[PDB]
Amino acid sequence: ADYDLKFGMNAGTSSNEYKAAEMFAKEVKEKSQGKIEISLYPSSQLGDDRAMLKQLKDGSLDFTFAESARFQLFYPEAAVFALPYVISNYNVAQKALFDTEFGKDLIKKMDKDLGVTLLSQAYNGTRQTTSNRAINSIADMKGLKLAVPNAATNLAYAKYVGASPTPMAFSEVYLALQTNAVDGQENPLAAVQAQKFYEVQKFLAMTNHILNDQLYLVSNETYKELPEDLQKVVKDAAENAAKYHTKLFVDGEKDLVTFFEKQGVKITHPDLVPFKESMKPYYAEFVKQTGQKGESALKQIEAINPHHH
Numbered sequence: 389a390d391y392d393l394k395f396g397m398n399a400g401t402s403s404n405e406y407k408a409a410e411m412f413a414k415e416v417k418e419k420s421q422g423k424i425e426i427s428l429y430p431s432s433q434l435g436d437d438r439a440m441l442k443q444l445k446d447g448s449l450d451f452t453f454a455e456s457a458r459f460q461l462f463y464p465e466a467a468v469f470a471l472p473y474v475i476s477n478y479n480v481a482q483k484a485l486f487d488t489e490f491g492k493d494l495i496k497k498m499d500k501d502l503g504v505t506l507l508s509q510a511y512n513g514t515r516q517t518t519s520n521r522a523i524n525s526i527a528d529m530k531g532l533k534l535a536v537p538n539a540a541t542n543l544a545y546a547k548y549v550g551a552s553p554t555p556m557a558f559s560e561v562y563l564a565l566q567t568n569a570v571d572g573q574e575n576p577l578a579a580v581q582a583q584k585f586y587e588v589q590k591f592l593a594m595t596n597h598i599l600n601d602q603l604y605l606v607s608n609e610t611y612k613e614l615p616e617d618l619q620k621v622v623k624d625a626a627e628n629a630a631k632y633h634t635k636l637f638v639d640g641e642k643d644l645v646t647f648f649e650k651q652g653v654k655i656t657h658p659d660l661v662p663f664k665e666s667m668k669p670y671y672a673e674f675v676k677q678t679g680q681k682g683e684s685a686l687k688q689i690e691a692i693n694p695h696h697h
């Protein structure tokens with residue numbers, strides 16, 4: 389094709405992210421009259437999300453996914469997106485990114501500093517905790533070996549609840565669970581399904597600890613080369629795909645607990661009051677480390693009403 393473009397992702401071929409990326413690719417091919425074709429590179433073939441963000445910056449990868457929270461790697465205050473229990477729901481995540489001064493500035497910085505254009509934002513699920521033994525209360529987290537991504541906020545979730553985190557690449561998690569190198573992991577339900585972590589975990593606890601969004605990002609090097617009518621095709625397709633992507637996750641969160649029960653998984657509902665209480669010293673450390681910018685981001689986000697209006 390005139391533009392042979394590439395979209396990399398950590399998620400695999402059985403995932404919501406991949407399905408939505410397929411919809412995106414199909415719409416762009418059709419509405420560009422075949423001028424643009426987008427090929428998909430799942431399961432971290434090109435590296436992880438940190439690596440793929442570097443490839444967008446350099447112009448060697450055209451599209452990828454990232455959470456708003458991932459930008460904490462560059463702007464420490466952006467950890468507010470994944471401080472456990474701070475963002476209440478997806479409604480708040482959306483307004484946090486697009487309708488706060490903090491969020492609007494982050495979008496500008498992604499463009500200026502990091503070579504990426506934000507096309508759309510989707511919901512990617514609320515993280516829960518699976519394990520090889522029941523989590524009936526926060527006491528059961530003590531010493532639990534928990535696989536987490538290489539991200540400060542997930543490491544902190546594990547630390548502050550009393551667990552023992554092992555950070556690793558997403559591709560490595562299944563084997564870690566299967567071999568009992570670790571005792572558990574903490575992705576959203578959709579990923580527990582997609583990766584078939586249910587095959588190698590007997591328990592699921594509704595910790596509801598971190599809310600994931602998902603940004604459709606394009607390399608500025610690629611987006612600048614597309615005539616404006618093709619920029620519009622890509623932007624519109626990303627917005628349409630994001631709506632679909634969100635719906636896949638919303639519907640799954642309704643249906644998946646029953647799916648897991650049918651596969652033999654036991655579901656628990658630990659009291660979350662102590663989980664939330666345990667994060668108070670982490671929020672204080674966040675404010676200590678990130679200073680006024682962090683305090684301000686927190687204030688802006690805490691001001692957002694979570695009820696749709």
Ligand SMILES: CC(=O)N[C@H]1[C@H]([C@H](O)[C@H](O)CO)O[C@](O)(C(=O)O)C[C@@H]1O
Pocket residue numbers: 397398399436437453454455457458536537538539556557558575
């Ligand atoms: C966009 C993207 O790659 N998201 C990935 C996230 C983020 O890397 C992490 O939450 C830090 O932001 O990690 C996983 O949940 C994980 O490894 O458990 C897999 C998921 O596909």
